[PDB]
């Protein structure tokens with residue numbers, strides 16, 4: 001049964017709740033972004049409205065094959081009416097097409113649902129700047145002060161430099177990047193751009209990227225592997241046995257892979273900086289981990305919530321145990337007491 005934190009009070013609206021069957025009372029199903037935990041359940045056989053971003057729309061039509069009529073895309077940053085409820089979609093700074101949703105209730109309550117987000121000061125000069133928000137449904141993925149990680153721009157700097165070094169030292173080395181969903185496209189695109197290449201990938205990954213309205217994308221990617229010295233692979237495949245295997249297939253065209261695993265937080269964030277990163281090495285293959293996050297750090301989250309001063313906070317992540325629930329509330333109280341709301 002759909003949990004209470006996936007429902008919006010005083011509406012027939014639900015948020016990312018596609019995996020329970022029909023939810024009695026729901027007139028409309030919002031989808032925040034195209035990631036399989038959030039969309040789990042959709043198919044070609046859905047005949048209720050889905051509201052989402054244009055980009056999420058394209059992925060629903062082209063990857064899951066939902067029928068064009070039931071996909072209602074909405075522009076961002078635009079006051080829109082949806083069954084006589086004002087809603088706005090805002091960029092969530094997560095993966096491509098990912099949104100937060102502002103709900104303006106009939107009664108006068110205003111609710112913000114973040115979806116998955118990486119909180120940023122640019123959001124403090126958006127449409128949220130204009131009015132009071134009473135309820136916040138919050139992405140709590142990293143709600144604990146251990147969770148620090150660098151800025152995305154720091155990581156992209158590191159990556160660009162590493163790859164450009166090696167390729168210039170050894171012109172027969174291949175760059176590889178791991179992936180399993182949308183998001184983190186800037187990693188492979190920034191690398192490929194510094195190296196004067198297109199990114200090569202499988203047919204299904206090419207199809208996925210062609211839905212994202214990336215500008216000039218036809219110049220940036222290809223399905224021709226031979227012609228490309230930055231390749232993408234399944235994240236499962238990014239290891240020695242799988243990279244060896246793949247290094248065979250290229251047929252004596254490269255003598256060294258230099259791979260990147262963009263990951264989230266790992267425990268090596270607690271003791272090591274980004275400028276002082278190393279890879280594992282089994283011969284001619286060297287695998288970098290790089291903590292490129294598309295979720296709020298503890299401090300970024302803190303700052304956003306303390307600016308917003310919401311009257312009530314409802315967590316959407318790590319709610320499955322009482323210990324996590326209890327721990328999170330403690331931080332919510334400290335924030336509110338420090339800030340005086």
Ligand code: NI
Pocket residue numbers: 033035094116
């Ligand atoms: Ni996500």
